[PDB]
Amino acid sequence: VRTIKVFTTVDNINLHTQVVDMSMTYGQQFGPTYLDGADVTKIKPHNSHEGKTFYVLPNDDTLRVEAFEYYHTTDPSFLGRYMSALNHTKKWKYPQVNGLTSIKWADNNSYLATALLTLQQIELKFNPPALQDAYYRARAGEAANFCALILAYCNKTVGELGDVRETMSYLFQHANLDSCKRVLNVVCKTCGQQQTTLKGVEAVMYMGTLSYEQFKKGVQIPCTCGKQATKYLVQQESPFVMMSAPPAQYELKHGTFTCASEYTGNYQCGHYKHITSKETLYCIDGALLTKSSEYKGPITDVFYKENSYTTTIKP
Ligand SMILES: [Cl-]
Ligand SMILES: [Cl-]
Ligand code: NA
Ligand code: NA
Ligand SMILES: [Zn+2]
């Protein structure tokens, strides 16, 4: 009976010594098994594998705790989805564009490129150690593990189309936004005033207009009475806000926003680009970069800096 020593893991930190039989596949011994993203379930141990670390699924009590502490999930297939994505994302390219880690276009990944570029321009800390560790690497330029985690957390495979707003929502749900607060007032002439307080992810996201200034002045929304009510921002305590709307031609004015996402085409058959407002307006499209003093395009998400805002509307 021939054996080698290998290590299994769910977090690539805590290792578990295994003595594996070289006459059996990894799958027969560990269940689904991966070597830096490559699926070795159906393969028998090679000599060169001695001492190497393999990912497995969290299919024992110790691994379940380690996986939950590191990723903050107990989705049974999470690790397989993360490894499957990593096998691809480790071959993607991550060029530095205007001082930020971008992603060379591949596998319909423009939504991930613009999400990744956005994260590097807003104040956000992640909760799962897996995202903390991988995001730090991504800022340094090695974003393969971060991108594979985004895919896994969002239940998207490599190649699958994704929506930036939805992706950001998932990332924000795995971020510490408990210091974020939003107070809204909704005023109908018939029905009166209704104040609502939003916290965390709902405090920094709004769907219906791209303009933070208009949100402060008031936006018209349906009232149940059939008239239009006015919704406006009473109070904001967030380091950023994200304003989203169905893509429409929209002018981005230098110095009035942090960054934005543009979507050209019809739904599920278009492409994202990223616009960042620095010394001028830079348009980052994966590896590609252009500049302009003005910008108009089909914008769908805009990010703004914030600290503390209180309205002056005396209603
Ligand atoms: Cl972080
Ligand atoms: Cl979390
Ligand atoms: Na950031
Ligand atoms: Na949170
Ligand atoms: Zn009403």
Curated annotation (Swiss-Prot):
Its localization reads:
Host endoplasmic reticulum membrane
Which residues of this UniProt protein bind Zn(2+) 6?
C188, C191, C223, C225
Catalytic residue list: S110 (for pl-pro activity), H271 (for pl-pro activity), D285 (for pl-pro activity)
Q: Give all residue intervals belonging to the Peptidase C16 domain.
A: 70-315
Q: How does it sit in the membrane?
A: Multi-pass membrane protein
Q: How is its activity regulated?
A: Inhibited in vitro by GRL-0617.
Q: Which chain segments does UniProt annotate as zinc-finger regions (C4-type)?
A: 188-225
Pinpoint the Ubiquitin-like domain residues. Answer: 1-56
Query: Superkingdom, according to UniProt?
Result: Viruses
| Catalysed transformations (reactions) | Thiol-dependent hydrolysis of ester, thioester, amide, peptide and isopeptide bonds formed by the C-terminal Gly of ubiquitin (a 76-residue protein attached to proteins as an intracellular targeting signal)
Provide the residue intervals of the LRR repeats: 116-138
Name the consequence of A144D.
Answer: In strain: Alpha/B.1.1.7
Subunit structure and binding partners: May form homohexamers. Interacts with N protein.
- Protein task: Responsible for the cleavages located at the N-terminus of the replicase polyprotein. Participates together with nsp4 in the assembly of virally-induced cytoplasmic double-membrane vesicles necessary for viral replication. Antagonizes innate immune induction of type I interferon by blocking the phosphorylation, dimerization and subsequent nuclear translocation of host IRF3. Also prevents host NF-kappa-B signaling. In addition, PL-PRO possesses a deubiquitinating/deISGylating activity and processes both 'Lys-48'- and 'Lys-63'-linked polyubiquitin chains from cellular substrates.
What is the protein named?
Answer: Papain-like protease nsp3
Query: From which organism does this entry originate?
Result: Severe acute respiratory syndrome coronavirus 2 (2019-nCoV)
Q: Lineage from the top down?
A: Viruses, Riboviria, Orthornavirae, Pisuviricota, Pisoniviricetes
User: Which gene is this protein's source?
Assistant: rep
